[PDB]
Amino acid sequence: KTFTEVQTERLEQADRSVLIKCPSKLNEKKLLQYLSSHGKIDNYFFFENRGIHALIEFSEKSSVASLQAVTGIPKAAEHHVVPYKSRLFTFTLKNPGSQAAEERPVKISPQSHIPVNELIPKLCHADSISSQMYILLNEYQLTEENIKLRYLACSLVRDFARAYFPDSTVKPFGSSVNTFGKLGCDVDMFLDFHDKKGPFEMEYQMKRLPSERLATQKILSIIGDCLDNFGPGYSSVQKILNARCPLVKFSHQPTGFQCDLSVSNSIAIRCSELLYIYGCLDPRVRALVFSLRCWARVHGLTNSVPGTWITNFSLTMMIMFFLQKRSPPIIPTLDQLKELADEKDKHVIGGYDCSFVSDLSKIKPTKNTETLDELLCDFFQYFGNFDFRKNSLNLRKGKEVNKPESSPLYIWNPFEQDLNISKNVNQPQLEKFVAMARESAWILQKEDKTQQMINKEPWGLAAVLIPF
């Protein structure tokens, strides 16, 4: 199960999946027994989002065609609609009178996490700090159902682009696939659209595309407008084509996701695969990232809108660096992963060698056994006393090194020669992070966990996940 194998398997599954707006009065078996007539169904689930929807995953892609064959355009408004046919259906009854089977309630797969205030109680009633972080992890991480929904969303966007770029794919990256995603996070999408004889050389006549950026802007502008007007479920479609990386933001109502669509950047795909590996190598890695993300949000260190704030990605890279520096390391360095690679795993982008192992079995398991109790406090202790003015984080080496340039917080981009991934960060925001980390370390170091439990007060992870 390499990252790339998973992507391909997840996309092929989304390829043969549909969404169905269910009627208020729903008989599960009737619906499935009926749908089974178009072909076998591998998976399905239901979820709540302005009424009940169902994701159905067929075994054959031919089943989707078969279902579409018997699907019609709304009769009452056959002239007041844009007749774009997708895989978003609505299932009403021929004879509403002839409902003829018992009505069971249906199971709702949740697509959002419980809010922070509900979580704090669950954390206090835990036993140790280690358990607290696993509760939080369990409460926040992506479920199987949610993952399928994210891949489906990509597949629906792909179908628009394939109109004129048949070979195109739309693939998710970032949180949605790097194992560090939490429920409610955006779906980041990459559009990837570049993928006998005779006495004549016969060629199709085809319109030539502009220069990369200009092509990107036009392709995304048109896809943006299609989502807007061919819909049906897309709203709040914001074009941000003048950004460094041209972008389209939108909301997808059937699934409920906030989505960001841009043209493929092969570097960002490697970062996502890298984090996947680190995520898959040890469960403490994930448990630690989820807790420290939440911590950063709680104290206002991270924001949703860009600026001088530390970004979740940068913060995630610090956590990886920190884990590279343990005795013994919990995860390997990127150079260690490069040297475990072969010719099959060779990727070279923009000159620089972005190669590393894809098979996890070839990585030797860590000997480290530090508990999350120690690791959380040490994270705060470590970066609370890290000399940021003099040192930078190199994830290739796994070492503190001299800064290539005067910048408050320098984190070496592992896939681009001299690039600081946290270049946005100013001195004030860095100092506020350091102060928060120091306070967090102090609280954990000098608290009575038993006496706080007895008093029904916050303790451990819960004590650091509330304002100071």
Ligand X SMILES: O=c1ccn([C@@H]2O[C@H](COP(=O)(O)OP(=O)(O)OP(=O)(O)O)[C@@H](O)[C@H]2O)c(=O)[nH]1
**Which stretches of the chain bind a copy of itself, using CB under 8 A?**
21, 23, 30-31, 34, 37, 67, 70-75, 77, 79-86, 88-95, 98, 160, 163-167, 193-194, 196-212, 215, 218-219, 221-222, 225-226, 229-233, 254
Look at residue 272 and give the partner it binds from Mg ion, ligand X, a copy of itself, none, a contact being a CB closer than 5 to 8 Å depending on partner kind: ligand X
With CB under 5 to 8 Å by kind, the binding choice for 73 among ligand X, a copy of itself, Mg ion, none is: a copy of itself
CA separation for the pair 240, 185 (Å, rounded):
19
Residue 349 contacts by C-beta under 8 Å, 6 or more apart in sequence?
Answer: 266, 267, 270, 415
Compute CA distances 181 → 123, 155, 188, whole Å.
20, 19, 11
- Per DSSP, 22 falls in state -
State how far the Cα of 202 lies from the Cα of 205, in Å rounded to an integer.
10
Query: In the bound complex, what is the minimum distance in angstroms from residue 188's beta carbon to ligand X?
Result: 5
For residue 141, what are the β-bridge partners? Answer: 182
Q: Does 174 bind ligand X (CB under 6 A)?
A: yes
Q: Give whichever of 210 and 300 is closer to a copy of itself, judged by the CB atom.
A: 210
Q: Which member of 54, 123, 267, 334 binds ligand X (CB under 6 A)?
A: 267
Are 333 and 339 spatial neighbours (Cβ–Cβ below 8 Å)? no
Angle at 341 between CA 339 and CA 347, to 5 degrees: 110
3-class DSSP state of 466 = coil
Which ranges in 351-396 belong to alpha helices (H)?
372-384
Closer to ligand X by CB, 276 or 322: give it. Answer: 276
Strand partners, 172: 189
**Does residue 175 touch Mg ion according to CB under 5 A?**
yes
Q: For residues 82 and 231, what is the distance between their CA atoms, to the nearest angstrom? A: 9
Q: Per rule CB under 6 A, is residue 248 in the interface with ligand X?
A: no
Q: Which is nearer to ligand X, 146 or 178 (CB)?
A: 178
Cis peptide before 328 (omega within 30 of 0): yes
Between 107 and 208, name the residue whose CB sits nearer to a copy of itself. Answer: 208
175 is in an annotated binding site: yes
Over the Cα atoms of the chain, what is R_g? 25
Q: How far is the CB of 240 from ligand X (least distance, A)?
A: 13
The site string for Mg ion over 188-207 (x = CB under 5 A, - otherwise) reads x-------------------
Site string for ligand X, 406-435 (x = CB under 6 A): ---------------x--------------
For residue 52, the minimal CB distance to a copy of itself (Å) is 14
d(CA 86, CA 65): 11
Name the residue nearer to a copy of itself (CB basis): 198 or 365.
198
Residues that bind ligand X (CB under 6 A): 173-175, 178, 180, 185-186, 188, 267-268, 271-272, 311-313, 421
Task: Enumerate the known binding-site residues for GTP.
Answer: 175, 293, 312
